[PDB]
């Protein structure tokens, strides 16, 4: 099983011509918590069209603390900061972001559209000590 601190992207089923949600999760968060994060999510833009990204339920004060931006087709930048640097570190495992995509009608049934972390993601704990994540990439399995 996954042990230790993990950043993981779900593998989900999707239908060409429909939309799909791809959760991005944190697990194994230590007592020291997560006060900041930044990472890149790449996705197969030949099959998926990015709509938006929503803060997951573990994200504290998301209206201020969370941001996500499509830098270019196939490349998202994700940012979290506890703007209080005091009372808003993430302590609870679960969904960090929900990525919303339209699946192109041309995408072939039986194929997959990869959704992955690009590079080494940056996390800081409540004293801004670096925290290294084990990364598991995901996909939309098209059916």
């Amino acid at each position: 099983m996954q042990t230790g601190f993990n950043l993981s992207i779900d593998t989900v089923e999707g239908n060409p011509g429909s939309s799909v949600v791809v959760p991005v999760k944190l697990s194994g968060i230590s007592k020291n918590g997560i006060s900041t994060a930044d990472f890149t999510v790449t996705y197969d833009a030949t099959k998926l069209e990015y709509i938006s990204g929503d803060a997951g339920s573990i994200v504290t004060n998301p209206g201020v603390n969370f941001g996500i931006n499509k830098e270019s087709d196939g490349k998202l930048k994700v940012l979290f900061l506890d703007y209080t640097m005091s009372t808003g570190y993430i302590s609870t495992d679960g969904v960090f972001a929900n990525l919303n995509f339209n699946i192109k009608s041309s995408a072939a049934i039986g194929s997959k559209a990869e959704v992955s972390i690009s590079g080494t993601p940056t996390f800081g704990d409540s004293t801004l000590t670096p925290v290294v994540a084990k990364v598991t990439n995901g996909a939309v399995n098209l059916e």
Binding site: S35, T36, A37, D38, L79, F80, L81, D82, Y83, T84, M85, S86, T122, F123, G124, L128, P130
Partner: peptide, 19 residues
């Protein structure tokens, strides 16, 4: 660490909060 990332963003926030 010779890189600009969210840790630097957080440190700057601490400075601007007076922490």
């Amino acid at each position: 660490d010779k890189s600009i990332n969210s840790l630097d963003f957080a440190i700057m926030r601490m400075y601007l909060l007076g922490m």
